[PDB]
């Protein structure tokens, strides 16, 4: 799926 990067 689309993603918008890591969040930790």
């Amino acid at each position, epitope marked *: 799926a689309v993603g*918008i990067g890591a969040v930790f």
Partner: antibody
Amino acid sequence: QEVLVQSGAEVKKPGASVKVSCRAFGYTFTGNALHWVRQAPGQGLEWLGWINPHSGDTTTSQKFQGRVYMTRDKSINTAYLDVTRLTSDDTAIYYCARDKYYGNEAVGMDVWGQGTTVTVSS
Amino acid sequence: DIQLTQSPSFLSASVGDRVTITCRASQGVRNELAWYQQKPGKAPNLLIYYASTLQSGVPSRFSASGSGTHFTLTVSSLQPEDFATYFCQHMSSYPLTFGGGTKVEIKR
């Protein structure tokens, strides 16, 4: 529990801008992507974009690029939606909505703000 | 943009009935599909994600299936609180898009 609280109703003239806010409570704000979706009266749901509150990175739907801007302020757990160059076609209820974001991908919108009504008219 | 077409758009049903709602996607979206309920004056609530996983807090009379371009939400043993509008949504590419909705109203 986990909730999103939005700012109050807005009324604007064509060509103006509006900034809607959305504050997260009960969970780590920067742990989940946040979407912005609108719904005009009697109509369906339209996705504007989303933001990673940790990094600030965003994706904006093609039709809103260069007109809608998403930001956040981690010190108050708040995301903002700025919609510029408004026209009456922007009259709608605007929602922020958290994504479950398992695996750092879109999965589904599980916590929604109460919505903010924006009316644009001459 | 991916177009999600729901059918039927409007349905009348009685308490205890089973309702089957279809979502067809204009191109394949794998399992990257969610379903929502919306009642008048309220934000939508998430029912299903990953095409067939039930969201916590949703009764087991909701179930869903499908992949690719054909998805189905089934609400068995319809209860009074289930009369609402239902929407599908994909997240397989940008922009995210939603189906047009299916409104389920009560027969009398």
